[PDB]
Design a protein around this ligand. Structure first.
Ligand SMILES: CC(C)=CCC/C(C)=C/CC/C(C)=C/CC/C(C)=C/Cc1cc(C(=O)O)cc(O)c1O
Length: 352
């Protein structure tokens, strides 16, 4: 054990926590992502996610931030279902709601009236194939006012999503119901593929973590297959390479590091986690953040298979006329990425 690397982990994590606490707005929300001149900036979703990421820290001032985040979420009580959504102006969705419920658990509010209502609302999103859909069709159609989408299918946006199902399966009340859907959707390579996210490491880590949390020995082979895939994704330099970031994605690497924590005996896995930690420490910016790489894609509403859509473009790079469908957006404030990385480092440090 190299005590300088443990102390650098402490310093890295503290710098990121300071960045994230200072990056809150007037009322205390974490904000990220932007649909310009349209749905605008994420808050309820980003806050639920960041707060859940930071729940792994022992710090009293972080717990106070999470208590405040929950109070902000409780004041967002305008939707009749009790759901949370991307931000105030959006309808509820199952992903935001599932992350908000993980934050509720961290602050002792899982059995609150609001949490019970929101958990009930998740049940509406259960599909006949055993997974969870992001949106209710009537709700998201009521929000969208784009003429060339008025008459299209919304079965892409309103079908079962593996990324959302994996997150909801972090809740003990849903883990058993979502199990068979999570098992049947694993690829022959050992990973899972999400709907909204470009980086499969996110869905793979979350799904493997839900299977691990259920404690069924029948799921252990699937978990180990996912770990093996993670080991192949992480190159020797300690990062996950992508087409967009061929020298390493901070977001994809952080989620791959979380996935590799699911095997604590294999020496090659332990070495790969060490390499990922070293690369993430090298990549941190002076202000404590990491470079944005949390790529969210917007399929067409009818598209059930966005991993089979070859046309993705980065919204911010499109010259001339453009639309959100078929584009990728990112976390312009680096809050979503930074919270992800800091969580992975806190979880990985004791297994150094
Ligand atoms: C599910 C998840 C990963 C996070 C939980 C939060 C969610 C829901 C993240 C996904 C991305 C989505 C759909 C976010 C909502 C906002 C929106 C509907 C964006 C597209 C858009 C807007 C408009 C418009 O605002 O007019 C017109 C569009 O044609 C159009 O595609």
């Amino acid at each position: 054990l190299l005590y300088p690397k443990l102390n650098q982990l402490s310093n890295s994590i503290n710098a990121a926590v300071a960045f994230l606490l200072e990056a809150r707005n007037l009322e205390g929300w974490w904000q990220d992502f932007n649909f310009p001149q349209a749905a605008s900036i994420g808050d309820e979703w980003v806050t639920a996610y960041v707060g859940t990421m930071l729940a792994t820290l022992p710090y009293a001032h972080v717990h106070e931030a999470l208590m405040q985040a929950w109070e902000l979420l409780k004041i967002r009580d305008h939707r009749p279902t009790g759901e949370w959504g991307y931000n105030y102006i959006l309808c509820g969705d199952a992903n935001t709601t599932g992350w908000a419920l993980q934050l509720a658990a961290a602050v002792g509010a899982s059995d609150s009236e609001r949490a019970q209502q929101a958990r009930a609302a998740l049940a509406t999103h259960l599909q006949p194939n055993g997974g969870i859909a992001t949106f209710a069709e009537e709700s998201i159609r009521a929000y969208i006012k784009v003429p060339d989408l008025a008459n299209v299918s919304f079965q892409g946006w309103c079908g079962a999503h593996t990324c959302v199902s994996a997150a909801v399966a972090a809740l003990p009340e849903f883990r058993s119901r979502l199990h068979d859907y999570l098992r049947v959707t694993q690829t022959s390579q050992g990973n899972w593929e999400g709907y909204w996210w470009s980086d499969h490491e996110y869905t793979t880590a979350l799904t493997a973590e839900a299977l691990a949390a259920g404690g069924q020995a029948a799921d252990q082979p699937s978990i180990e297959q996912a770990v093996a895939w993670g080991l192949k994704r992480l190159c020797p330099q300690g990062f996950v390479a992508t087409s967009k970031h061929p020298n390493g994605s901070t977001f994809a690497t952080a989620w791959c590091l979380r996935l590799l924590l699911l095997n604590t005996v294999d020496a090659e896995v332990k070495a790969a986690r060490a390499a990922a930690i070293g690369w993430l420490l090298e990549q941190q910016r002076p202000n404590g953040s990491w470079v944005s790489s949390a790529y969210l894609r917007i399929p067409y509403p009818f598209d059930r298979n966005p991993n089979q859509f070859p046309h993705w473009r980065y919204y911010d790079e499109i010259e001339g006329d453009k639309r959100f469908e078929g584009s990728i957006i990112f976390d312009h404030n680096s809050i979503f990425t930074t919270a992800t990385v800091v969580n992975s480092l806190v979880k990985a440090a004791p297994m150094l």
